[PDB]
Amino acid sequence: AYMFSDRSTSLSIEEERFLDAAEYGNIPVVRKMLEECHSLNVNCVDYMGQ
Amino acid sequence: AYMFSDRSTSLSIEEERFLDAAEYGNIPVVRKMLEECHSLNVNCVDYMGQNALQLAVANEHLEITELLLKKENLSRVGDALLLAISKGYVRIVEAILSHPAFAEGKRLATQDDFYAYDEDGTRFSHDVTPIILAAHCQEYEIVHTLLRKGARIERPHDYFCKCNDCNQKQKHDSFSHSRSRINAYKGLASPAYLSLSSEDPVMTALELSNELAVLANIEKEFKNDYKKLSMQCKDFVVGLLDLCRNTEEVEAILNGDVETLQSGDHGRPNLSRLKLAIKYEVKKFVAHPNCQQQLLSIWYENLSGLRQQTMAVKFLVVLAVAIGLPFLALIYWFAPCSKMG
Amino acid sequence: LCRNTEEVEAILNGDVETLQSGDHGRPNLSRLKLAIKYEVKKFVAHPNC
Amino acid sequence: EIEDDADVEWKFARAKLWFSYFEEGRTLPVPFNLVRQYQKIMKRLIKRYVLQAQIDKESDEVNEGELKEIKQDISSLRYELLEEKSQNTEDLAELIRELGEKL
Amino acid sequence: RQYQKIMKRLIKRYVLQAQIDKESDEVNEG
Amino acid sequence: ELKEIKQDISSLRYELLEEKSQNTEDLAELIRELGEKL
């Protein structure tokens, strides 16, 4: 039961939103989460490490 | 006056509107008709037999799909999942996999009419699970998502096996049994599954290429397909050797785990995988420059001079050993372990 | 496009219930002789045939 | 026959000739014989293979069924924007009429 | 009967696969 | 190169829908704050 996992963990529910907004172009959600979220890590990675 | 009619009736004037809105992307009309119309059938079909979910998934309408999946009355959800996997829509797949029918990864691997699309037949053959279809179409993200939910491709049995399911299948239909075996091998022999499903993909790909080359001779029909599957299992390894940039990566592709393998015979690497690539007849893995640069260093072992020499000088040293052969024979006989021995 | 053997027998052979059984315990090769008379070569040189 | 397999077959035959002399054994000729790190490296190579395979998949020529997706994107955007404009105009007109009925 | 059912599902497969093969031609300038 | 056009249309959709919702919300708030004076 091996998998190639480039982070080998689970994403938060407030970090998958930030990664989906950064990937698919949601500029107002990025503006909101980049100012009104102080517990956010801007260096969180997805399943491939980006 | 015959026609192919897949419903053989006439649509309502308030159902052709719903099907046009679902097909062509009219999200507010779908929001209005999905709440302010209680006499509507959400499973109405068009001239080909596709309801609103199979028309919104086939056109990449993620908002209409997420709007329709909250209905708890839809049919053809497994076929919509298979169609979205077939077309490569990752957001539609990740929205359909949150429906409460794939809750604990229930229907993603290995009778029930869940994946039917017509009330008579399925869109792909009955063996095809979501993981086999995601490995056929080379979808790396969908394969990673389905492997994350515990879905694997079950390796088929031997060709001469006699289990009490291998004989029931061959007694029911010996055509779809061979087709199912070749679909499972076509899913197993793909780079999207080989690179993400296993820990050492080079060893797995070499053994799988040997297995498919054996089954190409054992099973005389479908030979030209097992040859292709073995050829792409070899192409995976040859394209994985090409990406190496250091020499530790070259030594990790050509040779196995160095710390848990024997040192060899001399001060030279362990050529146990590289003999298996000759036995299994993987020609482009052995005829690659990153392999020739390793093999030439064992060929020209204690010869830094004769390696860089030109031709018509090695012919002269062949003639020189032709003249003085018993002297070198006496050197090897009496005094080995020397500057000539 | 055939996936079962009933679909293969419905493309290669006609309506089975309204055709003669043949000579032995073997299907009715009346369409498959017409595909040889009409010289349809890839229908007869197909693996399902 | 492809012109690139003619080199591959010869180099495979030459390597099969080489591998017969690598074995420790017959050194004198024919008249004289009568007297951890691996998991790290494999993980980075699998990541390179996945990224390069997606790059090579994004180099195939675009066909007729990938432009229809863009066409349906523009169609859905048109429907959504026109309904949002009509809804905003209707709400503004209603909230202005409900205050112009007080003057 | 069974022959009409089998021929109907095979004609539906042919129409869907023919539209899939038509949506695999290269896109032109028009 | 067509995926870049697709992401262009996606970003345009998100930006335009948020601008429409923000304009409607600001107009509704500034009309309510003057309809609470009649």
Author numbering:
A (entry chain B): 85 to 134
B (entry chain A): 85 to 194, 203 to 433
C (entry chain D): 335 to 383
D (entry chain A): 733 to 767, 853 to 920
E (entry chain D): 853 to 882
F (entry chain B): 883 to 920
Report text from the authors:
The mammalian TRPC subfamily consists of seven transmembrane proteins (TRPC1-7) that have been proposed to form non-selective cation channels in various cell types. TRPC6-mediated cation influx regulates physiological function of pulmonary endothelial cells, smooth muscle cells and glomerular podocytes, whereas TRPC6 hyperactivity has been implicated in maladaptive tissue and organ remodeling.
Detergent-solubilized TRPC6 (Δ2–72) was first purified to homogeneity in the presence of the antagonist AM-1473, and then exchanged into lipidic nanodiscs composed of the membrane scaffold protein, MSP2N2, and soybean lipids. The structure of the antagonist-bound TRPC6 in nanodiscs was determined at a resolution of 3.1 Å using single-particle cryo-EM. The antagonist engages in both hydrophilic and hydrophobic interactions with residues from S1-S4, the TRP helix and the membrane-reentrant loop following the TRP helix. The primary amine moiety off the piperidine ring forms hydrogen-bond interactions with Glu509 on S2, and Asp530 on S3. The benzonitrile group is involved in a cation-π interaction with Arg758 on the reentrant loop as well as aromatic-stacking interactions with His446 on S1 and Tyr753 on the TRP helix. The indene double ring makes van der Waal contacts with Tyr612 on S4. Overall, the three ring groups in the antagonist knit the intracellular ends of S1-S4, the TRP helix and the reentrant loop together. Mutation R758A, which disrupts the cation-π interaction, lowered the binding affinity by ~300 fold. We found that the AM-1473-bound TRPC6 and the BTDM-bound TRPC6 assume a nearly identical conformation (Cα-RMSD 0.588), with S1-S4 and the S4-S5 linker in the slightly up conformation, distinct from the slightly down conformation in agonist-bound structure.
